[PDB]
């Protein structure tokens, strides 16, 4: 491949219950942060921008 957001997000979302939503938001977050945490959940201290990103209701945005 040739886009690390697409590749990392496919891994990050590979065990998600709502895969299309996970891929959308992981993609948005990687476009903003240029970092995706490893594994399929947790590990967000690898990517402080990804970890801390919020939506308009103050809720965590990035899977």
JSON list of N, CA, C and O in Angstrom, two decimals:
[
{"chain": "A", "resi": 1, "resn": "UNK", "atom": "N", "xyz": [0.82, -1.19, 0.00]},
{"chain": "A", "resi": 1, "resn": "UNK", "atom": "CA", "xyz": [0.00, 0.00, 0.00]},
{"chain": "A", "resi": 1, "resn": "UNK", "atom": "C", "xyz": [0.86, 1.24, 0.00]},
{"chain": "A", "resi": 1, "resn": "UNK", "atom": "O", "xyz": [2.07, 1.16, -0.20]},
{"chain": "A", "resi": 2, "resn": "UNK", "atom": "N", "xyz": [0.23, 2.40, 0.22]},
{"chain": "A", "resi": 2, "resn": "UNK", "atom": "CA", "xyz": [1.00, 3.64, 0.24]},
{"chain": "A", "resi": 2, "resn": "UNK", "atom": "C", "xyz": [0.27, 4.72, 1.03]},
{"chain": "A", "resi": 2, "resn": "UNK", "atom": "O", "xyz": [0.33, 5.90, 0.66]},
{"chain": "A", "resi": 3, "resn": "UNK", "atom": "N", "xyz": [-0.41, 4.35, 2.11]},
{"chain": "A", "resi": 3, "resn": "UNK", "atom": "CA", "xyz": [-1.05, 5.34, 2.96]},
{"chain": "A", "resi": 3, "resn": "UNK", "atom": "C", "xyz": [-1.17, 4.75, 4.36]},
{"chain": "A", "resi": 3, "resn": "UNK", "atom": "O", "xyz": [-1.93, 3.80, 4.56]},
{"chain": "A", "resi": 4, "resn": "UNK", "atom": "N", "xyz": [-0.40, 5.28, 5.31]},
{"chain": "A", "resi": 4, "resn": "UNK", "atom": "CA", "xyz": [-0.36, 4.61, 6.61]},
{"chain": "A", "resi": 4, "resn": "UNK", "atom": "C", "xyz": [-1.63, 4.82, 7.42]},
{"chain": "A", "resi": 4, "resn": "UNK", "atom": "O", "xyz": [-1.88, 4.04, 8.34]},
{"chain": "A", "resi": 5, "resn": "UNK", "atom": "N", "xyz": [-2.43, 5.84, 7.12]},
{"chain": "A", "resi": 5, "resn": "UNK", "atom": "CA", "xyz": [-3.72, 5.94, 7.80]},
{"chain": "A", "resi": 5, "resn": "UNK", "atom": "C", "xyz": [-4.64, 4.80, 7.36]},
{"chain": "A", "resi": 5, "resn": "UNK", "atom": "O", "xyz": [-5.25, 4.12, 8.20]},
{"chain": "A", "resi": 6, "resn": "UNK", "atom": "N", "xyz": [-4.73, 4.56, 6.04]},
{"chain": "A", "resi": 6, "resn": "UNK", "atom": "CA", "xyz": [-5.56, 3.46, 5.55]},
{"chain": "A", "resi": 6, "resn": "UNK", "atom": "C", "xyz": [-5.10, 2.12, 6.12]},
{"chain": "A", "resi": 6, "resn": "UNK", "atom": "O", "xyz": [-5.92, 1.31, 6.56]},
{"chain": "A", "resi": 7, "resn": "UNK", "atom": "N", "xyz": [-3.79, 1.88, 6.14]},
{"chain": "A", "resi": 7, "resn": "UNK", "atom": "CA", "xyz": [-3.28, 0.60, 6.61]},
{"chain": "A", "resi": 7, "resn": "UNK", "atom": "C", "xyz": [-3.43, 0.45, 8.12]},
{"chain": "A", "resi": 7, "resn": "UNK", "atom": "O", "xyz": [-3.91, -0.58, 8.60]},
{"chain": "A", "resi": 8, "resn": "UNK", "atom": "N", "xyz": [-3.04, 1.47, 8.88]},
{"chain": "A", "resi": 8, "resn": "UNK", "atom": "CA", "xyz": [-3.16, 1.35, 10.33]},
{"chain": "A", "resi": 8, "resn": "UNK", "atom": "C", "xyz": [-4.62, 1.23, 10.74]},
{"chain": "A", "resi": 8, "resn": "UNK", "atom": "O", "xyz": [-4.95, 0.46, 11.65]},
{"chain": "A", "resi": 9, "resn": "UNK", "atom": "N", "xyz": [-5.51, 2.00, 10.10]},
{"chain": "A", "resi": 9, "resn": "UNK", "atom": "CA", "xyz": [-6.91, 1.94, 10.52]},
{"chain": "A", "resi": 9, "resn": "UNK", "atom": "C", "xyz": [-7.55, 0.60, 10.18]},
{"chain": "A", "resi": 9, "resn": "UNK", "atom": "O", "xyz": [-8.39, 0.12, 10.95]},
{"chain": "A", "resi": 10, "resn": "UNK", "atom": "N", "xyz": [-7.16, -0.03, 9.08]},
{"chain": "A", "resi": 10, "resn": "UNK", "atom": "CA", "xyz": [-7.67, -1.37, 8.82]},
{"chain": "A", "resi": 10, "resn": "UNK", "atom": "C", "xyz": [-7.31, -2.33, 9.95]},
{"chain": "A", "resi": 10, "resn": "UNK", "atom": "O", "xyz": [-8.14, -3.16, 10.36]},
{"chain": "A", "resi": 11, "resn": "UNK", "atom": "N", "xyz": [-6.10, -2.21, 10.51]},
{"chain": "A", "resi": 11, "resn": "UNK", "atom": "CA", "xyz": [-5.71, -3.05, 11.64]},
{"chain": "A", "resi": 11, "resn": "UNK", "atom": "C", "xyz": [-6.46, -2.66, 12.90]},
{"chain": "A", "resi": 11, "resn": "UNK", "atom": "O", "xyz": [-6.94, -3.52, 13.65]},
{"chain": "A", "resi": 12, "resn": "UNK", "atom": "N", "xyz": [-6.56, -1.36, 13.16]},
{"chain": "A", "resi": 12, "resn": "UNK", "atom": "CA", "xyz": [-7.19, -0.87, 14.38]},
{"chain": "A", "resi": 12, "resn": "UNK", "atom": "C", "xyz": [-8.65, -1.26, 14.46]},
{"chain": "A", "resi": 12, "resn": "UNK", "atom": "O", "xyz": [-9.18, -1.45, 15.56]},
{"chain": "A", "resi": 13, "resn": "UNK", "atom": "N", "xyz": [-9.31, -1.41, 13.31]},
{"chain": "A", "resi": 13, "resn": "UNK", "atom": "CA", "xyz": [-10.74, -1.65, 13.22]},
{"chain": "A", "resi": 13, "resn": "UNK", "atom": "C", "xyz": [-11.08, -3.09, 12.88]},
{"chain": "A", "resi": 13, "resn": "UNK", "atom": "O", "xyz": [-12.26, -3.41, 12.68]},
{"chain": "A", "resi": 14, "resn": "UNK", "atom": "N", "xyz": [-10.09, -3.98, 12.82]},
{"chain": "A", "resi": 14, "resn": "UNK", "atom": "CA", "xyz": [-10.29, -5.33, 12.29]},
{"chain": "A", "resi": 14, "resn": "UNK", "atom": "C", "xyz": [-11.11, -6.21, 13.21]},
{"chain": "A", "resi": 14, "resn": "UNK", "atom": "O", "xyz": [-11.39, -7.36, 12.83]},
{"chain": "A", "resi": 15, "resn": "UNK", "atom": "N", "xyz": [-11.46, -5.75, 14.41]},
{"chain": "A", "resi": 15, "resn": "UNK", "atom": "CA", "xyz": [-12.31, -6.52, 15.32]},
{"chain": "A", "resi": 15, "resn": "UNK", "atom": "C", "xyz": [-13.42, -5.64, 15.88]},
{"chain": "A", "resi": 15, "resn": "UNK", "atom": "O", "xyz": [-13.92, -5.87, 16.99]},
{"chain": "A", "resi": 16, "resn": "UNK", "atom": "N", "xyz": [-13.82, -4.63, 15.12]},
{"chain": "A", "resi": 16, "resn": "UNK", "atom": "CA", "xyz": [-14.83, -3.68, 15.56]},
{"chain": "A", "resi": 16, "resn": "UNK", "atom": "C", "xyz": [-16.23, -4.18, 15.24]},
{"chain": "A", "resi": 16, "resn": "UNK", "atom": "O", "xyz": [-16.45, -4.82, 14.20]},
{"chain": "A", "resi": 17, "resn": "UNK", "atom": "N", "xyz": [-17.18, -3.87, 16.13]},
{"chain": "A", "resi": 17, "resn": "UNK", "atom": "CA", "xyz": [-18.55, -4.27, 15.88]},
{"chain": "A", "resi": 17, "resn": "UNK", "atom": "C", "xyz": [-19.22, -3.45, 14.80]},
{"chain": "A", "resi": 17, "resn": "UNK", "atom": "O", "xyz": [-20.09, -3.95, 14.08]},
{"chain": "A", "resi": 18, "resn": "UNK", "atom": "N", "xyz": [-18.82, -2.19, 14.66]},
{"chain": "A", "resi": 18, "resn": "UNK", "atom": "CA", "xyz": [-19.27, -1.29, 13.60]},
{"chain": "A", "resi": 18, "resn": "UNK", "atom": "C", "xyz": [-18.04, -0.89, 12.80]},
{"chain": "A", "resi": 18, "resn": "UNK", "atom": "O", "xyz": [-17.45, 0.17, 13.02]},
{"chain": "A", "resi": 19, "resn": "UNK", "atom": "N", "xyz": [-17.64, -1.76, 11.86]},
{"chain": "A", "resi": 19, "resn": "UNK", "atom": "CA", "xyz": [-16.36, -1.59, 11.18]},
{"chain": "A", "resi": 19, "resn": "UNK", "atom": "C", "xyz": [-16.33, -0.34, 10.32]},
{"chain": "A", "resi": 19, "resn": "UNK", "atom": "O", "xyz": [-15.33, 0.39, 10.31]},
{"chain": "A", "resi": 20, "resn": "UNK", "atom": "N", "xyz": [-17.41, -0.06, 9.58]},
{"chain": "A", "resi": 20, "resn": "UNK", "atom": "CA", "xyz": [-17.42, 1.12, 8.73]},
{"chain": "A", "resi": 20, "resn": "UNK", "atom": "C", "xyz": [-17.31, 2.40, 9.55]},
{"chain": "A", "resi": 20, "resn": "UNK", "atom": "O", "xyz": [-16.61, 3.34, 9.15]},
{"chain": "A", "resi": 21, "resn": "UNK", "atom": "N", "xyz": [-17.98, 2.46, 10.70]},
{"chain": "A", "resi": 21, "resn": "UNK", "atom": "CA", "xyz": [-17.86, 3.64, 11.55]},
{"chain": "A", "resi": 21, "resn": "UNK", "atom": "C", "xyz": [-16.45, 3.76, 12.12]},
{"chain": "A", "resi": 21, "resn": "UNK", "atom": "O", "xyz": [-15.86, 4.85, 12.13]},
{"chain": "A", "resi": 22, "resn": "UNK", "atom": "N", "xyz": [-15.89, 2.64, 12.59]},
{"chain": "A", "resi": 22, "resn": "UNK", "atom": "CA", "xyz": [-14.52, 2.64, 13.09]},
{"chain": "A", "resi": 22, "resn": "UNK", "atom": "C", "xyz": [-13.56, 3.13, 12.01]},
{"chain": "A", "resi": 22, "resn": "UNK", "atom": "O", "xyz": [-12.69, 3.98, 12.27]},
{"chain": "A", "resi": 23, "resn": "UNK", "atom": "N", "xyz": [-13.70, 2.62, 10.79]},
{"chain": "A", "resi": 23, "resn": "UNK", "atom": "CA", "xyz": [-12.79, 3.03, 9.73]},
{"chain": "A", "resi": 23, "resn": "UNK", "atom": "C", "xyz": [-12.93, 4.51, 9.42]},
{"chain": "A", "resi": 23, "resn": "UNK", "atom": "O", "xyz": [-11.94, 5.19, 9.15]},
{"chain": "A", "resi": 24, "resn": "UNK", "atom": "N", "xyz": [-14.16, 5.04, 9.46]},
{"chain": "A", "resi": 24, "resn": "UNK", "atom": "CA", "xyz": [-14.39, 6.45, 9.19]},
{"chain": "A", "resi": 24, "resn": "UNK", "atom": "C", "xyz": [-13.71, 7.34, 10.22]},
{"chain": "A", "resi": 24, "resn": "UNK", "atom": "O", "xyz": [-13.01, 8.30, 9.88]},
{"chain": "A", "resi": 25, "resn": "UNK", "atom": "N", "xyz": [-13.90, 7.00, 11.49]},
{"chain": "A", "resi": 25, "resn": "UNK", "atom": "CA", "xyz": [-13.41, 7.85, 12.55]},
{"chain": "A", "resi": 25, "resn": "UNK", "atom": "C", "xyz": [-11.91, 7.68, 12.79]},
{"chain": "A", "resi": 25, "resn": "UNK", "atom": "O", "xyz": [-11.16, 8.63, 13.02]},
{"chain": "A", "resi": 26, "resn": "UNK", "atom": "N", "xyz": [-11.44, 6.43, 12.71]},
{"chain": "A", "resi": 26, "resn": "UNK", "atom": "CA", "xyz": [-10.00, 6.20, 12.77]},
{"chain": "A", "resi": 26, "resn": "UNK", "atom": "C", "xyz": [-9.34, 6.97, 11.63]},
{"chain": "A", "resi": 26, "resn": "UNK", "atom": "O", "xyz": [-8.30, 7.57, 11.82]},
{"chain": "A", "resi": 27, "resn": "UNK", "atom": "N", "xyz": [-9.96, 6.95, 10.45]},
{"chain": "A", "resi": 27, "resn": "UNK", "atom": "CA", "xyz": [-9.40, 7.69, 9.33]},
{"chain": "A", "resi": 27, "resn": "UNK", "atom": "C", "xyz": [-9.36, 9.19, 9.59]},
{"chain": "A", "resi": 27, "resn": "UNK", "atom": "O", "xyz": [-8.33, 9.84, 9.40]},
{"chain": "A", "resi": 28, "resn": "UNK", "atom": "N", "xyz": [-10.48, 9.75, 10.04]},
{"chain": "A", "resi": 28, "resn": "UNK", "atom": "CA", "xyz": [-10.53, 11.17, 10.39]},
{"chain": "A", "resi": 28, "resn": "UNK", "atom": "C", "xyz": [-9.46, 11.51, 11.42]},
{"chain": "A", "resi": 28, "resn": "UNK", "atom": "O", "xyz": [-8.75, 12.52, 11.30]},
{"chain": "A", "resi": 29, "resn": "UNK", "atom": "N", "xyz": [-9.33, 10.67, 12.45]},
{"chain": "A", "resi": 29, "resn": "UNK", "atom": "CA", "xyz": [-8.38, 10.95, 13.52]},
{"chain": "A", "resi": 29, "resn": "UNK", "atom": "C", "xyz": [-6.94, 10.86, 13.03]},
{"chain": "A", "resi": 29, "resn": "UNK", "atom": "O", "xyz": [-6.09, 11.66, 13.42]},
{"chain": "A", "resi": 30, "resn": "UNK", "atom": "N", "xyz": [-6.65, 9.88, 12.18]},
{"chain": "A", "resi": 30, "resn": "UNK", "atom": "CA", "xyz": [-5.31, 9.77, 11.63]},
{"chain": "A", "resi": 30, "resn": "UNK", "atom": "C", "xyz": [-5.02, 10.94, 10.68]},
{"chain": "A", "resi": 30, "resn": "UNK", "atom": "O", "xyz": [-3.89, 11.44, 10.64]},
{"chain": "A", "resi": 31, "resn": "UNK", "atom": "N", "xyz": [-6.02, 11.41, 9.94]},
{"chain": "A", "resi": 31, "resn": "UNK", "atom": "CA", "xyz": [-5.82, 12.60, 9.11]},
{"chain": "A", "resi": 31, "resn": "UNK", "atom": "C", "xyz": [-5.43, 13.80, 9.96]},
{"chain": "A", "resi": 31, "resn": "UNK", "atom": "O", "xyz": [-4.66, 14.66, 9.50]},
{"chain": "A", "resi": 32, "resn": "UNK", "atom": "N", "xyz": [-5.95, 13.88, 11.19]},
{"chain": "A", "resi": 32, "resn": "UNK", "atom": "CA", "xyz": [-5.65, 15.00, 12.07]},
{"chain": "A", "resi": 32, "resn": "UNK", "atom": "C", "xyz": [-4.35, 14.78, 12.84]},
{"chain": "A", "resi": 32, "resn": "UNK", "atom": "O", "xyz": [-3.55, 15.71, 13.01]},
{"chain": "A", "resi": 33, "resn": "UNK", "atom": "N", "xyz": [-4.12, 13.55, 13.30]},
{"chain": "A", "resi": 33, "resn": "UNK", "atom": "CA", "xyz": [-3.07, 13.26, 14.26]},
{"chain": "A", "resi": 33, "resn": "UNK", "atom": "C", "xyz": [-1.85, 12.57, 13.68]},
{"chain": "A", "resi": 33, "resn": "UNK", "atom": "O", "xyz": [-0.80, 12.59, 14.32]},
{"chain": "A", "resi": 34, "resn": "UNK", "atom": "N", "xyz": [-1.97, 11.93, 12.51]},
{"chain": "A", "resi": 34, "resn": "UNK", "atom": "CA", "xyz": [-0.87, 11.19, 11.88]},
{"chain": "A", "resi": 34, "resn": "UNK", "atom": "C", "xyz": [-0.31, 10.11, 12.81]},
{"chain": "A", "resi": 34, "resn": "UNK", "atom": "O", "xyz": [0.90, 9.92, 12.91]},
{"chain": "A", "resi": 35, "resn": "UNK", "atom": "N", "xyz": [-1.21, 9.39, 13.48]},
{"chain": "A", "resi": 35, "resn": "UNK", "atom": "CA", "xyz": [-0.84, 8.37, 14.46]},
{"chain": "A", "resi": 35, "resn": "UNK", "atom": "C", "xyz": [-2.07, 7.53, 14.78]},
{"chain": "A", "resi": 35, "resn": "UNK", "atom": "O", "xyz": [-3.15, 8.09, 14.99]},
{"chain": "A", "resi": 36, "resn": "UNK", "atom": "N", "xyz": [-1.93, 6.21, 14.80]},
{"chain": "A", "resi": 36, "resn": "UNK", "atom": "CA", "xyz": [-3.00, 5.30, 15.20]},
{"chain": "A", "resi": 36, "resn": "UNK", "atom": "C", "xyz": [-2.42, 4.37, 16.26]},
{"chain": "A", "resi": 36, "resn": "UNK", "atom": "O", "xyz": [-1.31, 3.83, 16.05]},
{"chain": "A", "resi": 37, "resn": "UNK", "atom": "N", "xyz": [-3.10, 4.12, 17.37]},
{"chain": "A", "resi": 37, "resn": "UNK", "atom": "CA", "xyz": [-2.55, 3.21, 18.38]},
{"chain": "A", "resi": 37, "resn": "UNK", "atom": "C", "xyz": [-2.58, 1.78, 17.87]},
{"chain": "A", "resi": 37, "resn": "UNK", "atom": "O", "xyz": [-3.46, 1.38, 17.10]},
{"chain": "A", "resi": 38, "resn": "UNK", "atom": "N", "xyz": [-1.59, 1.00, 18.30]},
{"chain": "A", "resi": 38, "resn": "UNK", "atom": "CA", "xyz": [-1.53, -0.40, 17.92]},
{"chain": "A", "resi": 38, "resn": "UNK", "atom": "C", "xyz": [-2.66, -1.19, 18.58]},
{"chain": "A", "resi": 38, "resn": "UNK", "atom": "O", "xyz": [-3.34, -0.72, 19.49]},
{"chain": "A", "resi": 39, "resn": "UNK", "atom": "N", "xyz": [-2.84, -2.42, 18.10]},
{"chain": "A", "resi": 39, "resn": "UNK", "atom": "CA", "xyz": [-3.91, -3.28, 18.62]},
{"chain": "A", "resi": 39, "resn": "UNK", "atom": "C", "xyz": [-5.27, -2.82, 18.13]},
{"chain": "A", "resi": 39, "resn": "UNK", "atom": "O", "xyz": [-5.40, -1.91, 17.32]},
{"chain": "A", "resi": 40, "resn": "UNK", "atom": "N", "xyz": [-6.31, -3.47, 18.65]},
{"chain": "A", "resi": 40, "resn": "UNK", "atom": "CA", "xyz": [-7.68, -3.16, 18.25]},
{"chain": "A", "resi": 40, "resn": "UNK", "atom": "C", "xyz": [-8.46, -2.41, 19.33]},
{"chain": "A", "resi": 40, "resn": "UNK", "atom": "O", "xyz": [-9.60, -2.00, 19.08]},
{"chain": "A", "resi": 41, "resn": "UNK", "atom": "N", "xyz": [-7.87, -2.21, 20.50]},
{"chain": "A", "resi": 41, "resn": "UNK", "atom": "CA", "xyz": [-8.44, -1.31, 21.50]},
{"chain": "A", "resi": 41, "resn": "UNK", "atom": "C", "xyz": [-7.32, -0.91, 22.45]},
{"chain": "A", "resi": 41, "resn": "UNK", "atom": "O", "xyz": [-6.23, -1.49, 22.43]},
{"chain": "A", "resi": 42, "resn": "UNK", "atom": "N", "xyz": [-7.58, 0.13, 23.23]},
{"chain": "A", "resi": 42, "resn": "UNK", "atom": "CA", "xyz": [-6.58, 0.60, 24.18]},
{"chain": "A", "resi": 42, "resn": "UNK", "atom": "C", "xyz": [-5.34, 1.15, 23.48]},
{"chain": "A", "resi": 42, "resn": "UNK", "atom": "O", "xyz": [-5.34, 1.49, 22.30]},
{"chain": "A", "resi": 43, "resn": "UNK", "atom": "N", "xyz": [-4.26, 1.23, 24.26]},
{"chain": "A", "resi": 43, "resn": "UNK", "atom": "CA", "xyz": [-2.93, 1.65, 23.80]},
{"chain": "A", "resi": 43, "resn": "UNK", "atom": "C", "xyz": [-2.90, 3.10, 23.33]},
{"chain": "A", "resi": 43, "resn": "UNK", "atom": "O", "xyz": [-1.99, 3.50, 22.60]},
{"chain": "A", "resi": 44, "resn": "UNK", "atom": "N", "xyz": [-3.87, 3.92, 23.75]},
{"chain": "A", "resi": 44, "resn": "UNK", "atom": "CA", "xyz": [-3.96, 5.26, 23.17]},
{"chain": "A", "resi": 44, "resn": "UNK", "atom": "C", "xyz": [-2.86, 6.20, 23.66]},
{"chain": "A", "resi": 44, "resn": "UNK", "atom": "O", "xyz": [-2.66, 7.25, 23.05]},
{"chain": "A", "resi": 45, "resn": "UNK", "atom": "N", "xyz": [-2.14, 5.85, 24.72]},
{"chain": "A", "resi": 45, "resn": "UNK", "atom": "CA", "xyz": [-1.01, 6.70, 25.09]},
{"chain": "A", "resi": 45, "resn": "UNK", "atom": "C", "xyz": [0.12, 6.66, 24.07]},
{"chain": "A", "resi": 45, "resn": "UNK", "atom": "O", "xyz": [1.02, 7.50, 24.13]},
{"chain": "A", "resi": 46, "resn": "UNK", "atom": "N", "xyz": [0.07, 5.73, 23.10]},
{"chain": "A", "resi": 46, "resn": "UNK", "atom": "CA", "xyz": [0.99, 5.79, 21.96]},
{"chain": "A", "resi": 46, "resn": "UNK", "atom": "C", "xyz": [0.76, 7.02, 21.11]},
{"chain": "A", "resi": 46, "resn": "UNK", "atom": "O", "xyz": [1.67, 7.43, 20.38]},
{"chain": "A", "resi": 47, "resn": "UNK", "atom": "N", "xyz": [-0.45, 7.59, 21.14]},
{"chain": "A", "resi": 47, "resn": "UNK", "atom": "CA", "xyz": [-0.84, 8.66, 20.24]},
{"chain": "A", "resi": 47, "resn": "UNK", "atom": "C", "xyz": [-1.63, 9.70, 21.03]},
{"chain": "A", "resi": 47, "resn": "UNK", "atom": "O", "xyz": [-2.86, 9.71, 20.99]},
{"chain": "A", "resi": 48, "resn": "UNK", "atom": "N", "xyz": [-0.94, 10.59, 21.74]},
{"chain": "A", "resi": 48, "resn": "UNK", "atom": "CA", "xyz": [-1.67, 11.55, 22.60]},
{"chain": "A", "resi": 48, "resn": "UNK", "atom": "C", "xyz": [-2.71, 12.39, 21.86]},
{"chain": "A", "resi": 48, "resn": "UNK", "atom": "O", "xyz": [-3.77, 12.68, 22.43]},
{"chain": "A", "resi": 49, "resn": "UNK", "atom": "N", "xyz": [-2.45, 12.78, 20.62]},
{"chain": "A", "resi": 49, "resn": "UNK", "atom": "CA", "xyz": [-3.45, 13.50, 19.84]},
{"chain": "A", "resi": 49, "resn": "UNK", "atom": "C", "xyz": [-4.69, 12.64, 19.60]},
{"chain": "A", "resi": 49, "resn": "UNK", "atom": "O", "xyz": [-5.82, 13.08, 19.81]},
{"chain": "A", "resi": 50, "resn": "UNK", "atom": "N", "xyz": [-4.48, 11.41, 19.15]},
{"chain": "A", "resi": 50, "resn": "UNK", "atom": "CA", "xyz": [-5.57, 10.46, 18.94]},
{"chain": "A", "resi": 50, "resn": "UNK", "atom": "C", "xyz": [-6.34, 10.21, 20.23]},
{"chain": "A", "resi": 50, "resn": "UNK", "atom": "O", "xyz": [-7.58, 10.18, 20.23]},
{"chain": "A", "resi": 51, "resn": "UNK", "atom": "N", "xyz": [-5.62, 10.03, 21.33]},
{"chain": "A", "resi": 51, "resn": "UNK", "atom": "CA", "xyz": [-6.23, 9.76, 22.63]},
{"chain": "A", "resi": 51, "resn": "UNK", "atom": "C", "xyz": [-7.16, 10.89, 23.06]},
{"chain": "A", "resi": 51, "resn": "UNK", "atom": "O", "xyz": [-8.25, 10.64, 23.59]},
{"chain": "A", "resi": 52, "resn": "UNK", "atom": "N", "xyz": [-6.74, 12.14, 22.86]},
{"chain": "A", "resi": 52, "resn": "UNK", "atom": "CA", "xyz": [-7.43, 13.27, 23.48]},
{"chain": "A", "resi": 52, "resn": "UNK", "atom": "C", "xyz": [-8.47, 13.92, 22.57]},
{"chain": "A", "resi": 52, "resn": "UNK", "atom": "O", "xyz": [-9.19, 14.81, 23.03]},
{"chain": "A", "resi": 53, "resn": "UNK", "atom": "N", "xyz": [-8.58, 13.49, 21.31]},
{"chain": "A", "resi": 53, "resn": "UNK", "atom": "CA", "xyz": [-9.50, 14.13, 20.38]},
{"chain": "A", "resi": 53, "resn": "UNK", "atom": "C", "xyz": [-10.95, 13.94, 20.82]},
{"chain": "A", "resi": 53, "resn": "UNK", "atom": "O", "xyz": [-11.35, 12.82, 21.17]},
{"chain": "A", "resi": 54, "resn": "UNK", "atom": "N", "xyz": [-11.73, 15.02, 20.82]},
{"chain": "A", "resi": 54, "resn": "UNK", "atom": "CA", "xyz": [-13.11, 15.01, 21.31]},
{"chain": "A", "resi": 54, "resn": "UNK", "atom": "C", "xyz": [-14.08, 15.44, 20.21]},
{"chain": "A", "resi": 54, "resn": "UNK", "atom": "O", "xyz": [-13.72, 16.18, 19.29]},
{"chain": "A", "resi": 55, "resn": "UNK", "atom": "N", "xyz": [-15.34, 14.99, 20.34]},
{"chain": "A", "resi": 55, "resn": "UNK", "atom": "CA", "xyz": [-16.43, 15.50, 19.51]},
{"chain": "A", "resi": 55, "resn": "UNK", "atom": "C", "xyz": [-17.07, 16.73, 20.17]},
{"chain": "A", "resi": 55, "resn": "UNK", "atom": "O", "xyz": [-16.63, 17.21, 21.21]},
{"chain": "A", "resi": 56, "resn": "UNK", "atom": "N", "xyz": [-18.15, 17.24, 19.56]},
{"chain": "A", "resi": 56, "resn": "UNK", "atom": "CA", "xyz": [-18.73, 18.49, 20.03]},
{"chain": "A", "resi": 56, "resn": "UNK", "atom": "C", "xyz": [-19.42, 18.35, 21.38]},
{"chain": "A", "resi": 56, "resn": "UNK", "atom": "O", "xyz": [-19.66, 19.36, 22.05]},
{"chain": "A", "resi": 57, "resn": "UNK", "atom": "N", "xyz": [-19.75, 17.13, 21.80]},
{"chain": "A", "resi": 57, "resn": "UNK", "atom": "CA", "xyz": [-20.35, 16.89, 23.10]},
{"chain": "A", "resi": 57, "resn": "UNK", "atom": "C", "xyz": [-19.31, 16.52, 24.14]},
{"chain": "A", "resi": 57, "resn": "UNK", "atom": "O", "xyz": [-19.67, 16.04, 25.22]},
{"chain": "A", "resi": 58, "resn": "UNK", "atom": "N", "xyz": [-18.03, 16.75, 23.84]},
{"chain": "A", "resi": 58, "resn": "UNK", "atom": "CA", "xyz": [-16.97, 16.45, 24.77]},
{"chain": "A", "resi": 58, "resn": "UNK", "atom": "C", "xyz": [-16.67, 14.98, 24.93]},
{"chain": "A", "resi": 58, "resn": "UNK", "atom": "O", "xyz": [-16.05, 14.60, 25.93]},
{"chain": "A", "resi": 59, "resn": "UNK", "atom": "N", "xyz": [-17.08, 14.15, 23.99]},
{"chain": "A", "resi": 59, "resn": "UNK", "atom": "CA", "xyz": [-16.87, 12.71, 24.04]},
{"chain": "A", "resi": 59, "resn": "UNK", "atom": "C", "xyz": [-15.68, 12.31, 23.18]},
{"chain": "A", "resi": 59, "resn": "UNK", "atom": "O", "xyz": [-15.43, 12.91, 22.13]},
{"chain": "A", "resi": 60, "resn": "UNK", "atom": "N", "xyz": [-14.96, 11.28, 23.61]},
{"chain": "A", "resi": 60, "resn": "UNK", "atom": "CA", "xyz": [-13.83, 10.78, 22.83]},
{"chain": "A", "resi": 60, "resn": "UNK", "atom": "C", "xyz": [-14.29, 10.37, 21.43]},
{"chain": "A", "resi": 60, "resn": "UNK", "atom": "O", "xyz": [-15.28, 9.66, 21.27]},
{"chain": "A", "resi": 61, "resn": "UNK", "atom": "N", "xyz": [-13.54, 10.82, 20.42]},
{"chain": "A", "resi": 61, "resn": "UNK", "atom": "CA", "xyz": [-13.90, 10.66, 19.02]},
{"chain": "A", "resi": 61, "resn": "UNK", "atom": "C", "xyz": [-13.21, 9.49, 18.33]},
{"chain": "A", "resi": 61, "resn": "UNK", "atom": "O", "xyz": [-13.74, 8.95, 17.35]},
{"chain": "A", "resi": 62, "resn": "UNK", "atom": "N", "xyz": [-12.04, 9.07, 18.82]},
{"chain": "A", "resi": 62, "resn": "UNK", "atom": "CA", "xyz": [-11.15, 8.21, 18.04]},
{"chain": "A", "resi": 62, "resn": "UNK", "atom": "C", "xyz": [-11.15, 6.80, 18.58]},
{"chain": "A", "resi": 62, "resn": "UNK", "atom": "O", "xyz": [-10.82, 6.59, 19.76]},
{"chain": "A", "resi": 63, "resn": "UNK", "atom": "N", "xyz": [-11.46, 5.78, 17.76]},
{"chain": "A", "resi": 63, "resn": "UNK", "atom": "CA", "xyz": [-11.60, 4.42, 18.28]},
{"chain": "A", "resi": 63, "resn": "UNK", "atom": "C", "xyz": [-10.28, 3.79, 18.72]},
{"chain": "A", "resi": 63, "resn": "UNK", "atom": "O", "xyz": [-10.17, 3.29, 19.84]}
]
